[PDB]
Coordinates of N, CA and C in Angstrom, one line a residue:
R1 N 69.5 143.8 72.2 CA 70.3 142.7 73.2 C 71.0 143.0 74.3
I2 N 71.8 142.4 75.6 CA 73.0 142.8 76.0 C 74.3 141.8 75.3
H3 N 74.9 142.2 75.9 CA 76.6 142.2 75.5 C 77.6 141.2 76.8
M4 N 77.3 141.8 77.5 CA 78.1 141.7 79.5 C 77.1 141.9 80.5
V5 N 76.4 140.7 81.0 CA 75.7 141.3 82.2 C 76.4 140.5 83.2
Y6 N 76.3 141.2 84.5 CA 76.2 140.9 85.9 C 74.4 140.1 85.7
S7 N 73.7 140.6 86.6 CA 72.5 140.0 86.7 C 71.7 141.5 86.9
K8 N 70.6 142.1 87.3 CA 69.8 143.1 87.3 C 70.2 144.4 87.3
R9 N 71.1 144.9 89.0 CA 71.2 146.0 89.1 C 72.6 146.7 88.4
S10 N 73.7 145.9 89.2 CA 75.2 145.8 88.3 C 74.9 145.3 86.5
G11 N 74.2 144.6 86.3 CA 74.0 144.1 84.9 C 73.3 144.8 83.6
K12 N 72.4 145.3 84.2 CA 71.6 145.8 83.5 C 70.8 147.0 83.8
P13 N 71.1 148.1 84.2 CA 70.5 149.8 84.4 C 70.0 149.9 82.6
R14 N 70.6 151.1 82.7 CA 71.5 151.7 81.2 C 71.6 150.8 80.0
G15 N 72.5 149.6 80.9 CA 73.0 148.4 80.5 C 71.8 147.1 79.5
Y16 N 70.4 147.8 79.7 CA 69.7 147.1 78.8 C 69.5 146.6 77.1
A17 N 70.3 147.7 77.1 CA 71.0 147.7 75.6 C 72.8 148.2 76.4
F18 N 73.4 146.7 76.3 CA 74.6 146.8 77.2 C 75.9 147.2 75.9
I19 N 75.6 146.4 74.6 CA 76.5 146.8 73.4 C 77.2 147.7 73.4
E20 N 76.2 148.8 72.7 CA 76.1 150.5 72.8 C 76.7 151.1 74.3
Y21 N 76.3 150.6 75.3 CA 76.7 150.9 76.7 C 75.6 150.3 78.1

C-alpha cells in the first residue's frame, strides 16, 4: 500500500511502498 502520495513522480517512485519509505 501507500501512506502519503502526491501523484506518480513526487508521490510514488520508491514511494510505492510509502509506509516504509
